[PDB]
Design a protein around this nucleic acid. Structure first.
Ligand SMILES: [Mg+2]
Ligand SMILES: [Mg+2]
Ligand SMILES: [Mg+2]
Ligand SMILES: [Mg+2]
Ligand SMILES: [Zn+2]
Ligand SMILES: [Zn+2]
Ligand SMILES: [Zn+2]
Length: 142
RNA sequence: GUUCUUCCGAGAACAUAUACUAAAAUUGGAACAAUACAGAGAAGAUUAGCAUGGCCCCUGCGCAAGGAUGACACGCAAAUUCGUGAAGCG
């Protein structure tokens, strides 16, 4: 990754490097863990889950905590440490807990609806438990 | 879950219906390798090649071409119907 961004990490990369380096360890384990004893839908879920976490950590450091400068935050977007297109959603009102961009692509669904996990729980038959097939998200709206 | 309201623990807006839903459990359907036998179209033999037909395939990208002429075919073929005189009887 860092080879492919040419400039050096700008300012306080040491604050985020040990955490990002742990997400890398997580992601490689998720790639190589056996697909046996798991649903054909389940095995992809940790990938989307870890990719959500890592993007969320970079995002929270810059926006909520302000512990990294914009140049270091934008560096993480440039170095593909965080998905700019997922962070682009968490800025939108009503999307601030979105699990993955695949769940808001309405075009890919049979009827042109969003994913069911995007329905607010108060609008469900709220005893109902959800695990959406795209990522196992139980509900990510309200 | 977030941006706001305040009399204050509630209210407005944003957000709005994934998935042949199984890690399964059941249930049909093709060709395989070879002991011994007798062995591959045309009025004697060696026998071309190309056609023809249907509820028969295979190889091939194929309206090309190969697969024994790819194999088969291989006869009670009656399918619109009679007409005659002798000789027994009774
Ligand atoms: Mg011949
Ligand atoms: Mg031929
Ligand atoms: Mg031949
Ligand atoms: Mg023939
Ligand atoms: Zn999702
Ligand atoms: Zn979903
Ligand atoms: Zn979701």
């Amino acid at each position: 990754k860092l080879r492919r961004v040419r400039k050096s990490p700008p300012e306080g990369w040491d604050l985020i490097e040990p955490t990002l380096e742990q997400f890398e360890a997580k992601m490689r384990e998720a790639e190589t863990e056996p697909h046996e004893g798991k649903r054909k839908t389940e095995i992809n879920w940790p990938i989307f889950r870890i990719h959500h976490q890592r993007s969320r950590y970079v995002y929270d450091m810059y926006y909520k905590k302000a512990e990294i400068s914009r140049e270091l935050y934008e560096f993480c977007l440039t170095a593909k440490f965080a998905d700019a297109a997922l962070i682009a959603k968490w800025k939108k009102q009503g999307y601030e807990n979105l699990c993955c961009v695949k769940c808001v692509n309405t075009r890919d669904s049979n009827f042109g609806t969003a994913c069911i996990c995007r329905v607010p729980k108060s609008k469900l038959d709220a005893e109902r438990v959800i695990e959406c097939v795209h990522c196992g998200c139980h509900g990510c709206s309200g």
